[PDB]
Amino acid sequence: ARVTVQDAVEKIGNRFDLVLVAARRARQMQVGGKDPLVPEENDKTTVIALREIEEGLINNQILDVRERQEQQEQEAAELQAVT
Amino acid sequence: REEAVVWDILDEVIREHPVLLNRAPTLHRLGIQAFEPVLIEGKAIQLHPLV
Amino acid sequence: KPLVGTGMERAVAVDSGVTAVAKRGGVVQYVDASRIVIKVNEDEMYPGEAGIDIYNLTKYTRSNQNTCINQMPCVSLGEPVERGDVLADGPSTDLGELALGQNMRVAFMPWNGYNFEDSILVSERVVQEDRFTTIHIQELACVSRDTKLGPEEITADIPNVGEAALSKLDESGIVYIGAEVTGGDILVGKVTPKGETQLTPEEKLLRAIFGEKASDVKDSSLRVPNGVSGTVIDVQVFTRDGVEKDKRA
Amino acid sequence: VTEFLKPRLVDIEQVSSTHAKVTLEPLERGFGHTLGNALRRILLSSMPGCAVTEVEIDGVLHEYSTKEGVQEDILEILLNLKGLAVRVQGKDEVILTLNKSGIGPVTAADITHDGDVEIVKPQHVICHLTDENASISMRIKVQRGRGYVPASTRPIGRLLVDACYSPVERIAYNVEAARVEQRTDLDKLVIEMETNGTIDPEEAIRRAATILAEQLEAFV
Amino acid sequence: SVTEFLKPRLVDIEQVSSTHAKVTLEPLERGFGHTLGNALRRILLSSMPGCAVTEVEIDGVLHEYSTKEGVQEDILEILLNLKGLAVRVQGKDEVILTLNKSGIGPVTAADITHDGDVEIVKPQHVICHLTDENASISMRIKVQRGRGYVPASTRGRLLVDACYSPVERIAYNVEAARVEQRTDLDKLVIEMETNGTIDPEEAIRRAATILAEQLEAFV
Amino acid sequence: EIKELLKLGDLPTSGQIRLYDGRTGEQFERPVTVGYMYMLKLNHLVDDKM
Amino acid sequence: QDVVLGLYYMTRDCVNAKGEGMVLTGPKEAERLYRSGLASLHARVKVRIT
């Protein structure tokens, strides 16, 4: 479970960008295709996203790089079946 | 009908779903704050003494 | 009977029209839970009519705040009474003294924070003895308005519900007196010939093809408000002239 | 450290039919208060009783009405029966029956004897009658139970009365000094319990100790 | 069908280094959590078989308000260190130990003479420090088997409060539990911390054994 | 006069008795005030508010 | 209201109480003493603190 978010805010010293990036991660985990990068402990996607930011393996930039790589893979594989 | 299986579903979903408690005359921003629900038998909100 | 009063309890109780004060003194003759009979003394008896007083107590009836006004006798058979004496004490009265609530052993001390700001910690004994149990009488009414598309009927035949929901209702579509109804049940099942539309592009034909009979029978109901349980203590039906009051009526 | 002494029952000063005074002796330092408090909690909390549960009066539909000839309201009768004291021995449930006619109080003694069930307070007034032509024929259902069981948590004639399965009503314990066995600093415990008469104090103490031992059996 | 209650089970025992633990019992009957917790707490911190130092005498001390030349710790500090000195002894009730040492450095507990069946559970316990090489410390401690806590105020010999009971700190916390249908239940969570002579679970089991044995005349 | 009425019975004159705790069985220091205050039940029930 | 009263009652000193003046090795045995009732909650003592 979670009580605070002070570590995550310490890692992202904005307190608002944290909400947006955590929301994006939770959305990616709920639609979702992707899977948690931290051992899930029977927690909803919000707590998982916040803990996963706490570990320091995701912020806005890392998530943007991952999305760019996923779009590149889609462009490539979709192209291979086309041409 | 309030079967015996719905309560387990409610427990599963209430886990990490903060709710906002907001007294009537919300003078200042602290008048509304979020807490993680805990299932209580009764009809009255149990609010932490400090707040 | 509040232990620490002010002596004004008796005046308030007797003056307010809740207790059945004795108009003329005498000797009680027959006192059951719903009637008191007083044999007027020889001195006070008027010359002529004889002429012994009868007091009809008002049993459980609704009040303006959904509270029960209950008068119960406080005298035993063969007990003399005087003019201005109290025979029956109404709600929240005791032997002619106004007793709004109860009194119980109280101890002023902080107890683990369960009485933090002004909260009160109650022992389960208070609940067990049922000394704060209060009877609330709630009135629910269903109307049969002479609306378009035909009138409304209070028959027991209702769609979209099996006999399980009709168990409490009698043959006339009204609940029995004394039924232990609960929240979400049906009290007075009324179904309106004022229901739903006529056949449109074989609506009924297609319903018959499917297997279900959707008719003009549209289910209204008088259902207890959700989460409210209790007992039905009375049912009163009012009918205008020339309407052929039903069997329950 | 020659190991602790084992407390054992030494006396039962049965002051009255209702409330008695049990004595436990000996007890080492601290054990007196501990055992007394534990037994008080167990006794007050859980002890089988025989409180009335259901009442079926012939001419009554619901508890909010009156019967001609009965001085008290029906709900008053149900409350008085809630106050009733009863002891059964061989059955989990029994259906007592009451039939009375004529002017005078309807005491619990008017309940049919049914020798297997003993009414511990024959003088308990249930209701009054007014005229000789008024009769009461009410079936009372009594069953074994524990703790407090409200009517809500559990035909139209039946009236449900809240159960009060708790024979005990007041437990008080004080630890005293007993200069016994030519040794000092040994405490004697007295458990003055006031029940409604539907349980023997020795049985109550033994059952309380049995419950506490069973609970402790988790990690012994 | 009216006597059996919800028999508690040790659902989980999470712990910290062997001197500390936390035992969770669930599900207990309504209000049974408090009685079990109180009984176990009282038995554990009031009367538990154990032994510890009771009286110590210095070579050159005759009042508790005294001092020794060449020791950083005064009399009160060294008495305190001896107070928590965990000791385990065999069937012998009372045994006297001797301590002699000189040499700049801490006076660890393990440096006490190892003769006899007395077992010391914390070898690195600090008893006293000394600064001067010429100065020396010579001590004899008395450990006896007792039945709880005996403050020295109860009546060259200096007394020390005898902390016989193994448990250092014990406290219980009653929390609300849940079952399929019933809701007003209790969950006893015993938080125990011993001095290291015995494991916390062993201490709880011995306390339960004592309390059950006290009831052999009833069950 | 309140003190006199207390003293007529076997009750303490100061109005405060010594109360033992129900749970832990230990005494409360600073004896507390105990008595029979007349309390009411107001017509504001939770189920009428929930 | 109640937490503050509790702490104020806890952290206070009277001239003399049960077990005044004894020296304690730490808070843990201080709690052990108080629960066992050997020394009152408010008793001037000497404690080893870390």
Contact status, residue G46 vs residue G13, Cβ threshold 8 Å: no
Inform me whether the C-beta atom of residue C124 falls under 8 Å from chain G C-beta atoms: no
Instruction: Tell me: cis bond preceding D167? Omega within 30 of 0 counts.
Output: no
Q: Which residues from E are below 8 Å from D8, CB to CB?
A: 217
State how far the Cα of G42 lies from the Cα of C117, in Å rounded to an integer.
Answer: 26
E109 by DSSP, 3-state: which? Answer: helix
Find the farthest-apart pair of alpha carbons in chain B and give their distance in angstroms, rounded. 42
State how far the Cα of C168 lies from the Cα of C179, in Å rounded to an integer.
Answer: 7
State how far the Cα of D95 lies from the Cα of B36, in Å rounded to an integer.
Answer: 50
Tokens in use for G47? 């404690």
Query: Please, which residues 147-206 of chain C have a Cβ atom closer than 8 Å to chain D?
Result: 176-180
Contact status, residue E48 vs residue E40, Cβ threshold 8 Å: no
Inform me whether the C-beta atom of residue A2 falls under 8 Å from chain B C-beta atoms: yes
Contact status, residue D58 vs residue D146, Cβ threshold 8 Å: no
D90 by DSSP, 3-state: which? Answer: coil
**Domain carrying residue E114:** 50-163
| Selection from D155, D194, D125 nearest residue D57 by Cα | D155
Residue with tokens 């059951």: C32
Residues of D92-108 as b/e, b for ≥16 C-beta within 10 angstroms?
A: eebebebebeeeeebbb
Contact check, Cβ <8 Å, G5/C117: no
DSSP string, C91-142: TTEETTEE--SEEEEEEES--TTTTSSS-----HHHHHTTSS---B------
A-B C-beta contacts closer than 8 Å: 12
User: Which residues neighbour C116 within 8 Å (Cβ) at sequence distance 6 or greater?
Assistant: B49, G1, G2
- Specify the CATH number for the domain of residue E158: 2.170.120.12
DSSP string, A18-83: HHHHHHHHHHHHHH-S---SS---S--HHHHHHHHHHTTS--HHHHHHHHHHHHHHHHHHHHHHH-
Among candidates E148, E204, E217 on the partner chain, residue whose Cβ is nearest the Cβ of D219: E204
The region, left, alpha or beta by phi > 0 then psi within -120 to 50, assigned to residue C54 is: beta
Question: What technique determined this structure?
Answer: cryo-EM
Q: Are strands E87-88 and E95-101 parallel, antiparallel or unpaired?
A: unpaired
State how far the Cα of E36 lies from the Cα of F41, in Å rounded to an integer.
Answer: 36
Inform me whether the C-beta atom of residue B44 falls under 8 Å from chain E C-beta atoms: no
State how far the Cα of F13 lies from the Cα of F2, in Å rounded to an integer.
Answer: 9
The enclosing H or E element of E212 equals helix E200-214
Q: Are strands E105-108 and E20-28 parallel, antiparallel or unpaired?
A: unpaired
In the structure, do chain E and chain A come into contact, i.e. share 3 or more CB pairs under 8 Å? Answer: no
State how far the Cα of D198 lies from the Cα of D205, in Å rounded to an integer.
Answer: 14
CA D70 to chain centre: 28
D86 by DSSP, 3-state: which? Answer: coil
Interface of G with C (CB under 8 A): 1-3, 5-6
Query: Please, which residues 199-228 of chain C have a Cβ atom closer than 8 Å to chain F?
Result: 227
- Tell me phi and psi for residue A19, to 5 degrees: -60, -45
Q: Taking chain A, what is the end-to-end CA distance rounded to the nearest angstrom?
A: 49
Tokens in use for E188? 């006893």
State how far the Cα of E115 lies from the Cα of E121, in Å rounded to an integer.
Answer: 15
Residues of C86-111 as b/e, b for ≥16 C-beta within 10 angstroms?
A: bbbbbbbbeebbbbeebbbeeeeebe
Residue with tokens 């207390």: F6
Bridge partners, residue D50, by sequence: none
Domains of chain A by residue range: 1-83
The enclosing H or E element of D130 equals none
State how far the Cα of A78 lies from the Cα of B37, in Å rounded to an integer.
Answer: 46
State how far the Cα of E10 lies from the Cα of D212, in Å rounded to an integer.
Answer: 17
Dihedral sign (CA D181, D184, D185, D191): positive
Tell me how far CA of residue A6 lies from CA of A42, A53, C90, C144, in angstroms.
22, 11, 62, 63
Contact check, Cβ <8 Å, G32/E161: no
Q: Are strands E20-28 and D87-88 parallel, antiparallel or unpaired?
A: unpaired
**Which of F44, F45, F48, F50 is the best substitution to test chain B (most B C-beta atoms within 10 A)?**
F50
Q: Which residues from B are below 8 Å from E187, CB to CB?
A: none
Q: Which residues from A are below 8 Å from B15, CB to CB?
A: 1, 42-44
Q: Which residues from C are below 8 Å from F43, CB to CB?
A: 65, 67
What's the resolution in A? 3.8
Q: Which residues from B are below 8 Å from A47, CB to CB?
A: 16
State how far the Cα of A58 lies from the Cα of C195, in Å rounded to an integer.
Answer: 60
Burial (Cβ within 10 Å: 0-12, 13-18, ≥19) of residue E10: middle
- Tell me phi and psi for residue E199, to 5 degrees: -70, 150
- Tell me phi and psi for residue C163, to 5 degrees: -65, -15
Q: Are strands G23-24 and G46-47 parallel, antiparallel or unpaired?
A: parallel
The secondary structure of chain F, three-state, reads: CHHHHHHHCCCCCCCEECCECCCCCCECCCCEEEEEEEECCCCCCHHHCC
Q: How many residues does chain F have?
A: 50
Write out the E strands in chain E. 9-15, 20-28, 50-58, 87-88, 95-101, 105-108, 119-120, 126-130, 137-146, 149-150, 158-159, 162-163, 167-177, 185-194
**Which residue type is seen at E87?**
V
C-D C-beta contacts closer than 8 Å: 63
Q: Are strands C72-73 and C80-81 parallel, antiparallel or unpaired?
A: unpaired
Other CB atoms within a 10 A radius of the CB of residue A20 amount to 12
| Selection from E176, E175, E147, E178 nearest residue E163 by Cα | E147
The region, left, alpha or beta by phi > 0 then psi within -120 to 50, assigned to residue E167 is: beta
Dihedral sign (CA D40, D42, D45, D50): negative
Q: Give CA torsion, residues E83, E85, E91, E97, to 10 deg.
A: -90
Eight-class DSSP state of E25: E
Contact check, Cβ <8 Å, C113/G5: no
Tell me how far CA of residue C103 lies from CA of C221, D170, F38, in angstroms.
43, 19, 4
**Interrupted after residues, chain B (C–N over 2.5 Å):** none
Inform me whether the C-beta atom of residue B1 falls under 8 Å from chain F C-beta atoms: no
Chains that touch E (3 or more CB pairs under 8 A): B, D, F, G
CA distance D88 to chain E (A): 14
State how far the Cα of C181 lies from the Cα of D71, in Å rounded to an integer.
Answer: 28
CA distance G42 to chain E (A): 17
Tell me how far CA of residue D157 lies from CA of A2, C87, C188, D55, in angstroms.
54, 31, 20, 9
Contact check, Cβ <8 Å, F34/C65: no
Q: Which residues from F are below 8 Å from E43, CB to CB?
A: none
The enclosing H or E element of C71 equals none
C-alpha gyration radius of chain F = 17
CA distance E58 to chain D (A): 28
The enclosing H or E element of E43 equals helix E32-46
Contact status, residue D47 vs residue D146, Cβ threshold 8 Å: yes
Q: Which residues from E are below 8 Å from B41, CB to CB?
A: 183-184
Q: Give CA torsion, residues C225, C231, C234, C236, to 10 deg.
A: 30
Inform me whether the C-beta atom of residue G32 falls under 8 Å from chain E C-beta atoms: yes
State how far the Cα of D197 lies from the Cα of C171, in Å rounded to an integer.
Answer: 49
Eight-class DSSP state of E140: E
State how far the Cα of E1 lies from the Cα of D212, in Å rounded to an integer.
Answer: 18
Residues of F5-26 as b/e, b for ≥16 C-beta within 10 angstroms?
A: eeeeeeeeeeeeeeeeeebbbe
Eight-class DSSP state of E21: E
Bridge partners, residue C68, by sequence: C62
Contact check, Cβ <8 Å, G22/E151: yes
C-alpha gyration radius of chain C = 27
State how far the Cα of F23 lies from the Cα of E39, in Å rounded to an integer.
Answer: 10
D9 by DSSP, 3-state: which? Answer: strand
Contact check, Cβ <8 Å, F47/C109: no
CA distance E46 to chain G (A): 6
Helix G27-36 vs helix E32-46: crossing angle, to nearest 10: 110
CA distance E210 to chain B (A): 37
Q: Give CA torsion, residues D141, D142, D144, D148, to 10 deg.
A: 90
User: Which residues neighbour C17 within 8 Å (Cβ) at sequence distance 6 or greater?
Assistant: none
Tokens in use for D96? 């007592």
